[model samples]
Target: WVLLSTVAAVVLGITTGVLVREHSNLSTLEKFYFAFPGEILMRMLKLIILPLIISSMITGVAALDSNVSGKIGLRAVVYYFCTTLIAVILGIVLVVSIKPGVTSTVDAMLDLIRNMFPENLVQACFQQYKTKREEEYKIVGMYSDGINVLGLIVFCLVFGLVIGKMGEKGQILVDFFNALSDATMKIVQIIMCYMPLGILFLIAGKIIEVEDWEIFRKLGLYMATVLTGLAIHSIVILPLIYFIVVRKNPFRFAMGMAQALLTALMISSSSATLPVTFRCAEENNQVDKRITRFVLPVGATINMDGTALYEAVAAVFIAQLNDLDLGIGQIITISITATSASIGAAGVPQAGLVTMVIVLSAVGLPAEDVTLIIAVDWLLDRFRTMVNVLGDAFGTGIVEKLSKKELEQ
Candidate 1:
């Protein structure tokens, strides 16, 4: 119960958050005021995020660096890559076996690649390039509102790796970043004190804000299959992998990360919840800050297990509905493309839906029909996000365990 307050807040918050919406007709202004605390909480968390990322990422890399302790970096990347691949495989297997047809790209891919090597680092901080369909057959490129997290992450990885080779000069920068990251953590601690309060209202406000609930009914079969796939990944595959690697109580590890996972669910964005994920991993789970700092940002940005699964399921579901008679090779293509597309989707707005386009196009499905799943995408997005955060947390613990010797020396 070390973090019981926030858990209680979330639990009660969901009940109250949902229950109040039906009975009350409060004005929009009143609802805004109700959610204000949560807004401040998010603001405070986001306020220090850039510095937190730069400092922590640099410090972590400088400690284990590429030239010397390369295994640590390699191990982390390999672990996530495997998990993401596994997610895609699992989704394809489930979708194919279940026959949910009763339910049921390249521009999006280029946009992802474009975001990665952002044209301008300064502009990337606030906006990233996106490809849009303006008219029936007219395409447009535009900037969207949201941090180019993948761009920043790519910059941090290189920047940190570079500093690792700087020798003494790098040590000074590392020390500076160490202090900065610590200061940001202190701010995280302060922000957390307000979290329980913020989470209560955050959930309540979001619940009250929903415009329609019937979307769930219309897409019942597809949503159920998607949720079923997510549940298997989150509950079975993830925990099984963690248990096999760490040989400890996987659920216990999950309990330690409950706060971070909940925040991911409420925010529905893994990058937005990175600060909270960092805190829970380092403090609650006792994952080495060195490991968490490097692993989490990468995971938050690219290691999207849930997204990979959802994309695979969505692509195949569309194929099934259209009676596309997808061949074995096509399913394999979907799996490969889904994994890559999920990674590319890291920072995009409505990322799941956007990336779904990539997977659809890769398999030669009707990219335009993505609108079919839009109704319930928002809700499923939250669940998948929790799994994504959980996957990252588990990866941190596993990476730390495997790299114990390197860290010890």
Candidate 2:
């Protein structure tokens, strides 16, 4: 089923690309109609995300009691984060050695950056464009100021810990949060009925606006590198962790994550998938309600393993393409910056790119590489979000197993 769906998606994507390229005379109304579905899907996802995250996290943490929640949350967070950092470093090493960004010229790269990160703030007035500019500025500023991702994660952890310690007073907030989360999830399910049409419109609109297929060739290596790293993490690293830690069938766990994975792919937001991912872990995987309640919500916020890996690979790819040689220390900086920004990045449009900009500027890569990725981001976001959902499931399964809970029936 996964194979068939993936193949269908690829075919649909390719066909849409061809149509847009071959028929470059689409009317504005026609283009808007095509773009409507993706916009709707995005909005539906956004509508549920904020309430879902806040409520789920509060409920998940409050259930643990302050001490248990703090200890377990801290350990689980450290383990998930460290693994992600290592994965990002490995991705960087592999992609730099392979040199995917080499085909695009330096001058062309400069133009891409200018187009991506416009110098004039007035020109960057559109929401998507504005978001990228802000992200680039924030990341660059953070890196220059020596702010760390680990420190940021630690800050979130402490905040959650404090919330857990709020006792009966906290329970009041937790109940309110849980109720809001549930209500928002119901809203998401209602919105999902429109998803098919949304996807169709989005794909069609993207097809109609495409001007050059040749530019895709330049991104071939970048795409391959990101996908390859994700594939390794999903198929190899995650399965191994599941087997060793849980002693359960990895295939079974994969089946459980399928729904959350699908939602993440369509919406391309980990936080948006939190409610669904939590439900699947609790219901399908038979994870301890407490563990699922605790680990998955926190995982959604901080365990961005896939995003970290992608950022590292992209930073190095951009550097290599620009003929910039990064020292060992600089590479280490990339790992730190990428991992940090991944955590700090809220699960929203261009969040990952914003974080990536920070990593790029940290290592002396131009911020404009963000624009190149933005063009292809809608597609890549799906893949990366799938990896993220899978990682979240993996984290839940591992935590359940470590607690000596039986994950399988």
Candidate 3:
């Protein structure tokens, strides 16, 4: 039902927006007509997220599996680094081999470098994702800034461990949080029904608001390269890890993440999509609450294979465009920089782009190349963000399986 509804809404919404876009120009009433439902829908979703996260984290950490011990952390970190490194390598290969951003020579490329970055578009691109603190105070609307998944996760981790030491006293609070988490799941049931309108209005808004046709012509190849890299990482490499490590068919795990993937694709922020991701883990995939609560949130924040890959491509593409050649040492610099940049990108505002600038500068590439990149960001952001959540859920499944098996043994 959810899949069908989402697909129908997207198809209809796109048609509406395209029909009434630009020349037709949707009236404020027509746009907000749907916006009204959109606002209420998000408020409903957001209402559950903070408490769900708090309760989920408290439970996951406080009642961690004995076998999980402190080992899951080390294992998770090791696995994340290994896969992210592979992701970066894949992206560098894609970008270098395909030469998406190298369509023109130095002079021609420089001419097209920053051609059509409207100030509004530029601001919208950077100012998109939210911080954890921002999620707490909506002030007025359902959407403000991106939620800070890391902030809540960090607090939960420390506090949960302390609670674990408290015995009966700890269990008391754990029971409360557990109950709260359950109630939130129940509430999520009814809230999900309203998603049709929410998704509908969102797609409509995206289509109607988009006005840049020039940017597409400018960064066409670069867009394909970045997307191809993301696809291979998301569908092929990421799933390969699941199969080799977990030894289960990844198709089931992938299907369970469907709702979260959809939300991540449209919203383009893993932070914003956290509520859906959490729900999918809890209800759809049968992930242990302990695993769901801790790993998913943290992964949403830091385990950014997709983000790392895209940054590597963008950084390298920028260098290539400027008629500059990077030696092996520089590629290593790009890898380390991309990985380092992804570490807390979710915690900070303007997540990947801010890190993109840091990376380009590190490689001695022109920062202005961001102009060409940002042109396609609004669209590519969705794809990469989907891959990020895919990885988070994928990692959660493997680690949970390993931890459970180890405990049983």
Candidate 4:
């Protein structure tokens, strides 16, 4: 999974930097030589995404029918809202009660105003997109010209619809795209297989370039607390809840749902990974076709269990760090805001961190602390995304099971 890959890269990079760089005066040629491999790897992954987007969108749109789409859509929306609401609540209770960071007594009723509507919703969407460049050391993506993964997904999906609406006339384009898509996947498979060495350079080169260990050093407690929250929620709490409601082992579900899970991890964007996520839900998890088509897309767009958890913890933790204590009313208020903003937040990387501005600012806390959280934001995102992907996939299965009973009537 990308989480493991990212960790491996960072650890290896840091180790290499410490063991290989501190003692030696490496020449410019050596530096460029070392960085080039990762540069190529980054570009390759970015370029590879274009084809995946086109093919996946075309196939998904062309396959949908009107009869079942509406039913699945509603089921997806309801399930997503419920699960995400729980995640935010879970995060709030854990952070507030556990006292993961310092505590304060700040009545933040006035600050809640800032959260009503983001200063600039569109700009906030890319806060994470912009911040990630720091972690990436400004490595240019192929379309990094400003068109992000979500932008491309929207474009591909629109064209897929256009092609879907046509009668037999669309088949030609369908055939062409399918053929092209098939070829592209072959390349993706190849890229993944050859990713071993490429990952090493990417991980190491970025570490060597930025050379900041303070993110790890200063944020260790916060990192552990966040990780602990995710671990308990995903491994224990979520699993128990899933078993009771659906009568399926959450552990077993994770394996079958891996196709989508891995996709979610690799791209770090749920919306972008929806095609694969939905496809896996049906083909791999054996969910109903209607359910996967309708629910999965909505889930990707709106369901962000992972983001909710992160925001709740981040907002409270940041306030604690600043020696401000949020009142019970503020906690309840932010519980609402975190879940609400998470829905509005783009299902993209570090989107939660960027939106933390909205939550903290709403609580009348200084949003300036956003910079502190951003230090570990990239690292924490890997863990948080697993929750989101699993929540969506498991949600499909739950709806898949539950809808049948209602439909039988």
Pairs of residues clashing in candidate 1? none
Residue-level lDDT of model 3, residues 307-329, one tens digit each, is 66687778877776676676554
List model 2 lDDT by residue over 1-409, tens digit each.
3223433443565577567757666777877666665666655544443344344444554455443346557657876876686676668767767778665233223322333343433322211111122432431111122222333233334545676677776666666766865775566556545544444445555555656654456578788888888888888888887798778889898898788888998777888888999888889988778777777767766676776568777777777667777655455556665765554445323555456655554344665445455445667768888887888788877876666633343
Error of 1 at 168 (Å): 21
| TM-score, structure 2 vs. true | 0.59
Candidate 1, 46-120: lDDT as tens digits: 454455555655666666634333786688788888888787777777777776664305666666567667778
Tens digits of per-residue lDDT, candidate 4, 185-252, equal 67755665445456566545545544556434435666666777787767776677678778987787
Candidate number with greatest TM-score: 2
Q: How high is each candidate's TM-score?
A: 0.57, 0.59, 0.56, 0.56
Clashes of 3: 3
lDDT of 4 at 221: 60
> In candidate 3, residue 41 scores what lDDT?
60
The better candidate by TM-score, 2 or 4, is: 2
Better of 1 and 2 by lDDT: 1
Query: Could you tell me the lDDT of residue 43 within candidate 2?
Result: 53
Question: Candidate 1, which ten residues in sequence have the lowest lDDT sum?
Answer: 340-349
Query: Total clashing residue pairs per candidate?
Result: 0, 4, 3, 5
